[PDB]
Amino acid sequence: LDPQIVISGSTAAFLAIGRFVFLGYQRREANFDSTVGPKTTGATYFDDLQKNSTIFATNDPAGFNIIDVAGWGALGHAVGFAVLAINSLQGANLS
Amino acid sequence: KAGNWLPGSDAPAWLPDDLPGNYGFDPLSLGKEPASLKRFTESEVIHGRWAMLGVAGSLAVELLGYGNWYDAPLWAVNGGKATWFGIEVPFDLNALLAFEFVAMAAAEGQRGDAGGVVYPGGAFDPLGFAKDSSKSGELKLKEIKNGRLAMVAFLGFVAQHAATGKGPIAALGEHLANPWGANFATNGISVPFF
Amino acid sequence: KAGNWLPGSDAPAWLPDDLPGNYGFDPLSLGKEPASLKRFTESEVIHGRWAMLGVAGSLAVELLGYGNWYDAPLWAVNGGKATWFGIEVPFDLNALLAFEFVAMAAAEGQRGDAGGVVYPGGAFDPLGFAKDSSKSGELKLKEIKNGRLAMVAFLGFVAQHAATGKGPIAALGEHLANPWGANFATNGISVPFF
Amino acid sequence: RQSWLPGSQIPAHLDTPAAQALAGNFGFDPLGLGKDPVALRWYQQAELIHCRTAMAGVAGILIPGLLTKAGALNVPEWYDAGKVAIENSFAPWGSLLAVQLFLCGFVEAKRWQDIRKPGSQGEPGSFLGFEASLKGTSELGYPGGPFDPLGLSKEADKWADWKLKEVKNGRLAMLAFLGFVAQKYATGAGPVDNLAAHLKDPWHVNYATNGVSLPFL
Amino acid sequence: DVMQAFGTPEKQILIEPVFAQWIQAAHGKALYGFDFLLSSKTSAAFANGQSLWLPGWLDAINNNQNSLFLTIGP
Amino acid sequence: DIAGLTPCSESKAYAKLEKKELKTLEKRLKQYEADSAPAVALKATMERTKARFANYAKAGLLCGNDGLPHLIADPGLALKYGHAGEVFIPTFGFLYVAGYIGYVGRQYLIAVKGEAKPTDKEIIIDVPLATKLAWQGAGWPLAAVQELQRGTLLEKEENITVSPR
Numbered sequence: 001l002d003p004q005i006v007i008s009g010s011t012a013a014f015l016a017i018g019r020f021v022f023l024g025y026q027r028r029e030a031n032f033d034s035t036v037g038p039k040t041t042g043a044t045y046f047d048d049l050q051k052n053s054t055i056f057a058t059n060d061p062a063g064f065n066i067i068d069v070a071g072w073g074a075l076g077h078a079v080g081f082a083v084l085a086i087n088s089l090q091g092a093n094l095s
Numbered sequence: 096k097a098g099n100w101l102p103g104s105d106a107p108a109w110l111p112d113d114l115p116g117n118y119g120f121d122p123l124s125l126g127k128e129p130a131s132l133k134r135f136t137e138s139e140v141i142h143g144r145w146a147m148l149g150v151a152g153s154l155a156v157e158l159l160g161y162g163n164w165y166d167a168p169l170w171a172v173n174g175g176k177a178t179w180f181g182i183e184v185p186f187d188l189n190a191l192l193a194f195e196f197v198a199m200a201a202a203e204g205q206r207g208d209a210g211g212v213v214y215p216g217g218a219f220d221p222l223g224f225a226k227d228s229s230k231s232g233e234l235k236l237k238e239i240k241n242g243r244l245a246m247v248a249f250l251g252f253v254a255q256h257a258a259t260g261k262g263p264i265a266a267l268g269e270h271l272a273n274p275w276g277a278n279f280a281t282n283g284i285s286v287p288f289f
Numbered sequence: 290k291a292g293n294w295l296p297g298s299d300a301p302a303w304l305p306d307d308l309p310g311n312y313g314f315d316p317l318s319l320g321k322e323p324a325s326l327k328r329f330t331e332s333e334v335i336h337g338r339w340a341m342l343g344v345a346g347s348l349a350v351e352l353l354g355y356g357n358w359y360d361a362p363l364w365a366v367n368g369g370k371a372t373w374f375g376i377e378v379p380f381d382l383n384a385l386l387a388f389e390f391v392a393m394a395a396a397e398g399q400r401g402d403a404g405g406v407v408y409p410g411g412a413f414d415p416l417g418f419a420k421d422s423s424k425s426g427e428l429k430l431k432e433i434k435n436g437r438l439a440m441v442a443f444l445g446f447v448a449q450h451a452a453t454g455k456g457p458i459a460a461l462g463e464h465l466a467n468p469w470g471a472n473f474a475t476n477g478i479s480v481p482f483f
Numbered sequence: 484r485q486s487w488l489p490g491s492q493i494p495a496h497l498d499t500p501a502a503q504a505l506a507g508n509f510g511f512d513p514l515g516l517g518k519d520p521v522a523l524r525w526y527q528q529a530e531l532i533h534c535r536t537a538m539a540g541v542a543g544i545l546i547p548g549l550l551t552k553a554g555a556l557n558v559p560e561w562y563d564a565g566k567v568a569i570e571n572s573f574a575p576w577g578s579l580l581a582v583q584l585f586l587c588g589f590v591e592a593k594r595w596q597d598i599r600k601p602g603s604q605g606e607p608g609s610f611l612g613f614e615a616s617l618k619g620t621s622e623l624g625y626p627g628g629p630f631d632p633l634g635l636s637k638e639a640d641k642w643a644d645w646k647l648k649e650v651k652n653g654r655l656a657m658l659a660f661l662g663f664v665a666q667k668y669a670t671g672a673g674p675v676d677n678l679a680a681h682l683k684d685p686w687h688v689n690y691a692t693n694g695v696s697l698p699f700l
Numbered sequence: 701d702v703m704q705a706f707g708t709p710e711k712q713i714l715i716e717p718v719f720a721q722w723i724q725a726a727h728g729k730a731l732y733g734f735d736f737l738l739s740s741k742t743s744a745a746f747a748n749g750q751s752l753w754l755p756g757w758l759d760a761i762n763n764n765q766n767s768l769f770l771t772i773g774p
Numbered sequence: 775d776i777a778g779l780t781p782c783s784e785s786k787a788y789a790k791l792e793k794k795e796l797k798t799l800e801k802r803l804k805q806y807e808a809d810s811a812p813a814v815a816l817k818a819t820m821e822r823t824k825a826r827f828a829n830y831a832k833a834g835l836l837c838g839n840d841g842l843p844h845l846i847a848d849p850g851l852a853l854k855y856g857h858a859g860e861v862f863i864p865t866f867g868f869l870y871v872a873g874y875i876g877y878v879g880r881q882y883l884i885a886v887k888g889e890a891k892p893t894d895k896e897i898i899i900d901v902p903l904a905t906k907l908a909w910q911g912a913g914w915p916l917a918a919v920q921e922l923q924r925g926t927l928l929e930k931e932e933n934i935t936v937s938p939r
């Protein structure tokens with residue numbers, strides 16, 4: 001199989017559904033983590049290491065920041081290589 | 096109440112009377128919690144609707160002479176090409192999974208966010224059969240009764256094939272040939288001691 | 290009341306006097322409940338009408354020499370072509386079942402939604418014999434008595450065929466030939482001994 | 484007060500008016516199985532079904548057996564009839580039994596629900612108009628209605644007498660079948676053949692000399 | 701022990717580990733003759749893995765000189 | 775056969791085992807007289823040994839490579855191949871007796887709890903009552919089940935003492 005089509009194709013699908021299908025659902029479940037509350041309430045260096053010091057703002061209308069791009073892109077790459085690797089096993093000698 | 100599954104019994108309290116297809120059948124009291132029953136009510140309709148499509152599809156394939164429901168995906172294994180009504184299809188297995196996963200995710204994800212809708216209507220009822228909303232009681236009862244019947248039938252397809260290995264239409268023909276000598280009591284599988 | 294089935298016996302209270310064909314015969318009290326009696330009153334007439342057509346058809350086939358009622362459908366299993374008055378009919382078993390099922394379902398479905406009408410009239414009474422109320426009373430009695438006789442007669446055909454393996458008209462001729470030699474006692478099945 | 488053993492103390496639970504209403508009450512309950520009133524109501528039904536089933540079965544072993552000896556019939560021994568019938572049969576015994584369990588299970592299930600809720604099978608609309616005649620009578624285990632075509636249960640004077648005859652013949656029939664089973668293993672012959680042997684030489688052909696029942700002797 | 705002391709080794713109670721021997725059959729040990737799953741050459745489980753690891757696995761499990769699923773008894 | 779076993783009647787090792795045991799007995803026999811007391815006892819032992827090996831073979835047991843009978847415990851395998859008498863049937867034989875003993879003791883213990891001094895009825899047994907309960911225990915499975923369905927088999931959680939938690 002052509003890696004460029006399969007890997008890019010799978011990544012596009014996983015980015016497309018993530019942006020257009022599961023974005024609303026994913027955000028709602030992320031607020032279920034708000035009900036419990038913040039991890040720590042302190043002002044020491046080690047307490048600062050547990051806070052969202054940097055907020056990743058995005059200009060995308062739906063709020064599809066880079067962290068979401070990395071998450072959904074990784075699933076597409078993972079699925080893409082699973083498809084390629086399995087299809088490679090066809091026509092393998094002594095393997 | 097649509098009837099009584101066990102004549103002379105008392106209907107469970109937690110099963111509301113107007114619920115479509117309510118025969119009072121809940122031996123294990125799985126629907127006792129109102130929140131759980133609400134989910135179960137939706138799942139039964141969705142399971143039944145898929146079963147109705149599946150049983151109709153499984154019978155249709157063999158009636159028209161295109162094989163049985165079990166052999167349909169063998170082309171993707173042996174190396175042949177897909178066919179629909181005898182018309183060759185240009186896709187392969189890995190391609191098919193792509194369209195289905197994306198397509199079904201969009202539809203099911205859109206349904207999921209509706210928060211438990213089971214009778215949408217509107218665009219899903221173009222002819223307006225249930226637009227009345229008052230006479231829909233019978234149609235909802237007819238849908239669930241055919242849905243439950245289809246779910247039982249499909250389990251028969253899977254169970255029968257695992258025992259005899261023949262398609263649903265072929266099995267029916269074999270029963271009619273020798274009703275007393277060809278049935279579940281003659282598999283050699285269903286009843287070990289027969 | 291038409292009469293008395295067992296002279297010197299009392300009539301059941303639950304059986305109305307004006308009900309056609311009322312002989313006060315209900316040993317098992319199956320019609321004691323009014324709801325049950327209403328359904329059975331319709332079913333007796335429906336059975337009677339079907340039996341009367343059935344008996345007439347069974348006798349007509351053998352009188353005209355086209356066979357007996359029993360072996361008419363053998364061509365399907367044996368393998369052959371249907372016949373009616375000796376003229377070939379192109380349909381086959383699969384075609385007959387489909388058309389019969391659809392036609393009977395539509396016709397019987399219409400009657401089912403009526404609610405239990407036994408004497409519709411109008412479209413079903415083109416000659417208007419039962420238009421007059423006074424005349425209808427006696428015609429209903431005549432219908433049921435002939436219908437009850439036809440129901441018994443058909444039971445005679447089936448039971449006699451099982452014992453003797455012959456058609457109704459063939460058996461009647463055999464009995465006339467040797468009345469004391471051919472009868473239920475002499476068929477070797479009806480009476481256990483001898 | 485007739486009792487199975489004169490001079491013995493009848494169990495208290497069998498002397499209650501409810502208990503004495505049962506047919507065939509001779510105070511026989513040494514193991515105290517009927518002490519609980521709810522249990523006794525259930526065991527009474529079990530006896531009636533065992534009684535009636537045993538009578539039908541014994542009649543089907545005995546009457547054909549005598550007529551076979553008389554030469555009016557040719558029926559194999561009750562312990563062989565199963566094999567003989569299945570040969571010239573339209574179905575194998577696996578299919579025949581499976582149908583038997585569906586039909587018996589359905590009919591038995593309705594009888595079961597009447598024990599739990601007497602008269603509950605006359606639920607309007609439950610059956611195709613036939614539920615009216617499935618209510619049974621005021622006495623559990625005596626359905627009547629369609630099961631009493633001749634209406635012999637409508638005579639109040641003869642009612643107690645009829646029930647006693649049924650239980651007496653039923654208990655005798657139950658013991659008869661236990662004798663058929665024990666006499667097949669003990670003697671290796673048919674029931675009527677065993678009777679013929681005993682009558683020929685009663686004092687030498689019995690269980691005391693069959694070489695099985697009394698191993699010590 | 702009493703049976704052995706009295707010289708009647710045939711009177712002792714030896715229960716076959718059928719449940720554990722049945723597991724070994726499912727993994728391909730053909731000694732017990734259960735012909736179950738990997739022990740049967742017609743099962744789907746046997747066929748699917750027949751090109752990846754079963755040839756090596758089945759060869760080792762049926763070698764009785766190694767400790768891979770030793771034969772078990774009473 | 776089952777699990778690689780073979781019927782003892784067809785087992786070579788099983789047959790050889792019988793000869794070894796009989797040979798040992800015969801060796802001791804030849805140091806006595808024909809009809810002396812020791813000789814008669816030894817001959818009686820040999821008869822029982824021969825009978826034992828015939829009975830086990832006749833019973834259709836399975837022998838391993840050791841040539842000793844092995845028992846089948848799975849109910850499905852036992853009923854499938856007629857080994858129900860090894861473990862399956864004796865299983866329900868023991869439970870009837872075990873329930874009999876336990877049920878009889880429980881009935882007696884309940885009976886004396888109503889007496890004025892239950893403790894003195896336990897060290898000093900009320901034999902007339904014990905014999906009465908001993909015979910009525912034959913129907914324990916019926917009585918045991920009916921207690922379970924009527925809900926009088928178990929105590930209430932609120933009437934049982936428990937430690938702090």
Ligand code: CHL
Nearest residue numbers: 540561562563564565566567569575576577579580581583
């Ligand atoms: C009352 C039930 C009943 C009894 C006692 C028998 C007994 C017998 N059948 Mg018969 N059958 C019975 C029902 C049926 N049989 C057959 C079909 C056959 C065949 C085809 C054959 C026999 C044969 C035989 C005889 C030889 C041994 C055998 O095959 O045993 C196996 C069967 C049994 C031992 C049945 C035992 C059933 C038992 C009453 C169950 C009770 C369970 C309850 C829960 C009660 C529990 C409490 C306890 C205390 C009883 C044996 C005398 C064979 C024969 O004639 O050989 C010469 C034979 O070939 N039977 C059918 C049709 C499906 C039956 C349906 O009910």
Ligand code: CLA
Nearest residue numbers: 247248250251254255258259266267269270277278279282
């Ligand atoms: C939807 C109902 C249905 C129907 C019409 C059939 C019909 C058939 N089955 Mg199938 N079957 C079904 C459900 C059904 N099955 C289910 C749910 C299972 C899983 C338990 C099986 C498991 C099964 C096996 C293992 C075998 C069959 C076989 C057969 C055939 C012979 C009869 C037999 O042994 O049935 C077996 C029937 C049952 C185990 C009980 C089914 C009870 C149904 C669901 C009751 C439905 C309600 C009502 C009482 C009847 C409505 C009828 C319907 C037409 C509307 C026949 C074509 C045999 C075959 O292929 O022979 C050649 C065969 O080997 N079936």
Ligand code: CLA
Nearest residue numbers: 284287718719720722723734847848849850851852853854
């Ligand atoms: C203690 C647990 C235990 C275990 C590990 C086994 C193990 C086994 N049993 Mg046994 N069995 C047990 C308890 C157990 N049984 C009990 C309590 C009963 C009821 C008294 C039975 C009744 C029984 C029957 C009737 C049969 C077996 C059989 C079997 C074998 C294969 C099926 C099986 O049970 O798979 C693993 C076990 C389990 C998951 C536990 C439940 C097992 C159920 C009760 C029986 C399943 C039978 C199966 C559907 C038969 C299909 C045909 C087979 C040839 C593949 C296997 C050696 C079958 C045999 O003889 O195969 C050669 C067989 O026919 N068992």
Ligand SMILES: CC(/C=C/C=C(C)/C=C/[C@@]12O[C@]1(C)C[C@@H](O)CC2(C)C)=C\C=C\C=C(C)\C=C\C=C(C)\C=C\[C@@]12O[C@]1(C)C[C@@H](O)CC2(C)C
Nearest residue numbers: 121122123124125142145146149152153164167246249250
């Ligand atoms: C049996 C079933 C569910 C049964 C549930 C039961 C009995 C529950 C019973 C109870 O819980 C109650 C109610 C109440 C409790 O108190 C008691 C119990 C007893 C616990 C569902 C089946 C559900 C079945 C479903 C959804 C089937 C769907 C099938 C499809 C889509 C098939 C598609 C295809 O067949 C085609 C068309 C062509 C082929 O080539 C390819 C494929 C893909 C195979």
Ligand SMILES: CC(/C=C/C=C(C)/C=C/[C@@]12O[C@]1(C)C[C@@H](O)CC2(C)C)=C\C=C\C=C(C)\C=C\C=C(C)\C=C\[C@@]12O[C@]1(C)C[C@@H](O)CC2(C)C
Nearest residue numbers: 315316317318319336339340343346347358361440443444
């Ligand atoms: C006998 C019968 C019913 C009898 C009922 C009885 C005695 C009931 C009695 C009691 O309930 C009462 C009243 C009151 C209770 O207190 C007591 C009892 C005792 C319980 C019905 C027959 C009913 C008979 C009917 C409906 C027959 C229909 C026949 C047809 C359609 C035949 C068609 C064909 O024959 C052709 C024409 C040509 C062939 O080639 C093909 C075929 C298909 C075979």
Ligand SMILES: CC(/C=C/C=C(C)/C=C/[C@@]12O[C@]1(C)C[C@@H](O)CC2(C)C)=C\C=C\C=C(C)\C=C\C=C(C)\C=C\[C@@]12O[C@]1(C)C[C@@H](O)CC2(C)C
Nearest residue numbers: 512513514515533536537540543544561564657658660661
């Ligand atoms: C149902 C029954 C028999 C049914 C037989 C049938 C259907 C036979 C059918 C067939 O034969 C035919 C016709 C023809 C054959 O070709 C085929 C078969 C199929 C073989 C017997 C029950 C037989 C039942 C018996 C014997 C039960 C006995 C119970 C006793 C003695 C209990 C005593 C006590 O319990 C009390 C009452 C009170 C306590 O306090 C004390 C104790 C002592 C515990």
Ligand SMILES: CC1=C(/C=C/C(C)=C/C=C/C(C)=C/C=C/C=C(C)/C=C/C=C(C)/C=C/C2=C(C)CCCC2(C)C)C(C)(C)CCC1
Nearest residue numbers: 011015069070071072073074075076077078079080081082
């Ligand atoms: C701007 C814009 C746009 C566009 C966009 C784009 C074009 C994007 C892209 C994106 C992308 C393109 C992304 C990507 C990502 C990726 C990633 C994130 C990856 C990851 C990976 C991984 C993680 C891997 C791993 C691994 C390895 C390493 C080895 C083997 C195994 C595995 C596979 C697992 C649009 C028009 C739409 C809209 C408007 C605006």
Ligand SMILES: CCCCCCCCCCCCO[C@H]1O[C@H](CO)[C@@H](O[C@H]2O[C@H](CO)[C@@H](O)[C@H](O)[C@H]2O)[C@H](O)[C@H]1O
Nearest residue numbers: 021022025028029200203204205206207208209210211
């Ligand atoms: C061969 C056939 C295989 C079929 C495999 C099916 C896999 C299903 C994976 C589902 C993954 C989760 O996705 C699904 O989560 C929730 C339902 O659980 C839905 O989301 C909704 O669910 C909650 C619970 O019902 C609702 O209260 C909320 O409105 C919302 O959170 C998502 O919109 C849906 O997409």
